[PDB]
Amino acid sequence: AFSYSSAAGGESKKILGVFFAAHEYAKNPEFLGCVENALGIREWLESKGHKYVVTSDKDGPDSELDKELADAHILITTPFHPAYMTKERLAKAKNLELLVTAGVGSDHIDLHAAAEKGLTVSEVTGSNVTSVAEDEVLRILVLVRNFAPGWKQVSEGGWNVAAVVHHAYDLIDRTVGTVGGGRIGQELMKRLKGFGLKEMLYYDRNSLGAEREKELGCKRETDLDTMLSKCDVVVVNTPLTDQTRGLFNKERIAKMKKGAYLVNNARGAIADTEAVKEACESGHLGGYGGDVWNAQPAGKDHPWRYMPNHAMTPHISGTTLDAQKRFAAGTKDMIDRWLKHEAFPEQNYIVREGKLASQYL
Amino acid sequence: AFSYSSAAGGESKKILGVFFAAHEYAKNPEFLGCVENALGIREWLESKGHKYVVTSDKDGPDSELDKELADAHILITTPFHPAYMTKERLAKAKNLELLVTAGVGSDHIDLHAAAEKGLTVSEVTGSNVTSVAEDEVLRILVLVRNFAPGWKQVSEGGWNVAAVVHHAYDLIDRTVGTVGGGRIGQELMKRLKGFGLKEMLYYDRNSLGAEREKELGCKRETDLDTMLSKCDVVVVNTPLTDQTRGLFNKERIAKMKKGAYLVNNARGAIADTEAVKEACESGHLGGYGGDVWNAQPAGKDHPWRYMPNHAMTPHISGTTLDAQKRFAAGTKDMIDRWLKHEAFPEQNYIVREGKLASQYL
Numbered sequence A, B: 001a002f003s004y005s006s007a008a009g010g011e012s013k014k015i016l017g018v019f020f021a022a023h024e025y026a027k028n029p030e031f032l033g034c035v036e037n038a039l040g041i042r043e044w045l046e047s048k049g050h051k052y053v054v055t056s057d058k059d060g061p062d063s064e065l066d067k068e069l070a071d072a073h074i075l076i077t078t079p080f081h082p083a084y085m086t087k088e089r090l091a092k093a094k095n096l097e098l099l100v101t102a103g104v105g106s107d108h109i110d111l112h113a114a115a116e117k118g119l120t121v122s123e124v125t126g127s128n129v130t131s132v133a134e135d136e137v138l139r140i141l142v143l144v145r146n147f148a149p150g151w152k153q154v155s156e157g158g159w160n161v162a163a164v165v166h167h168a169y170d171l172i173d174r175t176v177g178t179v180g181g182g183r184i185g186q187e188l189m190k191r192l193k194g195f196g197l198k199e200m201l202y203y204d205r206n207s208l209g210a211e212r213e214k215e216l217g218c219k220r221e222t223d224l225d226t227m228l229s230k231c232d233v234v235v236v237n238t239p240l241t242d243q244t245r246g247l248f249n250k251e252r253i254a255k256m257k258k259g260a261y262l263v264n265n266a267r268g269a270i271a272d273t274e275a276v277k278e279a280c281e282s283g284h285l286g287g288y289g290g291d292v293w294n295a296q297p298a299g300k301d302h303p304w305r306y307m308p309n310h311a312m313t314p315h316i317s318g319t320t321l322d323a324q325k326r327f328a329a330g331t332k333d334m335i336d337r338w339l340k341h342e343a344f345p346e347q348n349y350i351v352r353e354g355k356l357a358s359q360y361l
């Protein structure tokens, strides 16, 4: 009922948010990361005379996302329920100036297309990198120690120790490799310190400190194939870039030790769907697990749901209640800064001044 | 077909082993811990002119265990499929001199009764204490991060991030308490080092080093109730003694923080069955998980199978293929030493010279 705002010329800005529905779970106000509570920023936007419109309806061209997209200045996405911003969707977005990811990973945006339009793309760098590091250890131990079939077995009334431990091992004196030595890569190695690994290995374009490598008890592998062929466990910790799409194909998976484990809480598309299914069926992989899929939601018939020895979940690790707090705060901050014509922290920029952040090249 | 042995007077000794069946999984000879492969010691016993008899049939009084028990000199048990050696069963065991546990925890033996008969009870101290420490971290992360419902959800074709993360948290800046600062207690704290806990706490009759406490980043809690009321997560790491039976009752569970997590890979009976079920149903417990049950096998109707927020499996953690190697070797060694009238390592003795090891008092 108020026509103006505290912005230039009192132009009312429209902020569009796409979040999953929490339905009854939204009764917990700590549950910020959902369409119902919308990061708890509605009153703070409405009180500036700005418009705040949110939806969980992002799929197909009849979507609330496509309706509302035309006159939106600011788009908030979340990786857990990601608005896929194609060249077409960006081109219809006539007022769009800022794309902010409530989480980490902005690959659900056409970054090359956003860059060409001079749009700004940002994410809450660092906000759930500890949460994913914890979940990666979870997935390693669950696959190595064969937890899931055992939990299934006793929940359905059975008792057969052998049907579980015929495929259960200890992590001690095994070799773990992280593809990526970024924030999550490093938080993983910090958390694998006490497990008495043979070696902790990382592959990245960037050497860490010699001092950092000592701190993390890790060693750099120059060649990826050289790292993979030493590893009992492989963890994916890169963004989804043009370099990293389908990086874990037939060829690259056969380069891994027989019965080795593949954990991916980075992005599904970094691992070829059919290649992971088959190597799980053959046993060339001891198992595959992660919260991330090449389509979000994953179609009912995504094979990663039904393949053997999998530790799959929906996209949960970076959106625990504790993670939601951090990326909510970071999202509000960047919208605050944008309205104040203030630079974001340099690390939060994925696309700025028509250029992609070096880690997406 | 040979009537004598390399023992005193060439008395053929009978070694009785009770193991679970591995059926087809016994095709893997690394799968030592099963009735079919029987720790791979048959030829080494038979070649000394000793008798080796093994069975998975240990339950009821019509059992192969009860038939064979009468004339057995040496009994090998395993906690994963434990022969319950009651006062009655011991009294029928006319030749029995040595009870050796292929694993750790000999509570499935009436130790007070074994002590009265002057029998020797031993276990492979240290043999799977790293394996259980790993699995305890597994169970903590699985319960805190709510893995299991998510794995169930996607395996049955669903997709609902909220139905999982409404009860999913991060471990960082939370407080973990281990009831027991023994081998597993210590291997747990070593593995929780990198998780940025608020505090790592332990309760034990025995202080560790001041130097050890620094090494483990831990602090001692004198009063159990004082430890419990600070703890987001509680891990059970004591043997099942007279002190520790039903230690986790109604009263003691209500002393834990609301929505706190209880992990038990020690022994089921340390936690009252109904008390754990109810506190899981009320949410006073965020969840309960472990591989150990007060009856082994657990009856089809054990409530811990069907209660909410559980991370239960059969008894697997201390009998991964890697653990089986270590307790097989230790069992063969102690039988070797017994035949040579050689003392076992002091730590392997549960019952010696009519006395119980201090940690079972």
Ligand SMILES: NC(=O)c1ccc[n+]([C@@H]2O[C@H](COP(=O)([O-])OP(=O)(O)OC[C@H]3O[C@@H](n4cnc5c(N)ncnc54)[C@H](O)[C@@H]3O)[C@@H](O)[C@H]2O)c1
Residues within 6 Å of the ligand: A104, A105, A106, A126, A128, A129, A132, A180, A181, A182, A183, A184, A185, A203, A204, A205, A206, A237, A238, A239, A240, A241, A243, A244, A265, A266, A267, A291, A292, A315, A316, A317, A318, A319, A359, A360, A361
């Ligand atoms: N499951 C979740 O909820 C969740 C949450 C957080 C992040 N993620 C995913 O994890 C990714 C990693 O996050 P982060 O915080 O570690 O980011 P980061 O930018 O700190 O780390 C990424 C690392 O990858 C390296 N890299 C990029 N392309 C490479 C290539 N071709 N070869 C070698 N190294 C390459 C970079 O040098 C960098 O060190 C995110 O981009 C996101 O896709 C998922």
Ligand SMILES: NC(=O)c1ccc[n+]([C@@H]2O[C@H](COP(=O)([O-])OP(=O)(O)OC[C@H]3O[C@@H](n4cnc5c(N)ncnc54)[C@H](O)[C@@H]3O)[C@@H](O)[C@H]2O)c1
Residues within 6 Å of the ligand: B104, B105, B106, B126, B128, B129, B132, B180, B181, B182, B183, B184, B185, B203, B204, B205, B206, B237, B238, B239, B240, B241, B243, B244, B265, B266, B267, B291, B292, B315, B316, B317, B318, B319, B359, B360, B361
């Ligand atoms: N799930 C499995 O497969 C598996 C495998 C290994 C052991 N376990 C169980 O774990 C138990 C612990 O194993 P461990 O290797 O740490 O043994 P440990 O003897 O090194 O540690 C036990 C600790 O409990 C303490 N303790 C005993 N009674 C106590 C009491 N009333 N109050 C306070 N402290 C008390 C002792 O002081 C000791 O430090 C075993 O007895 C066994 O029951 C299970």
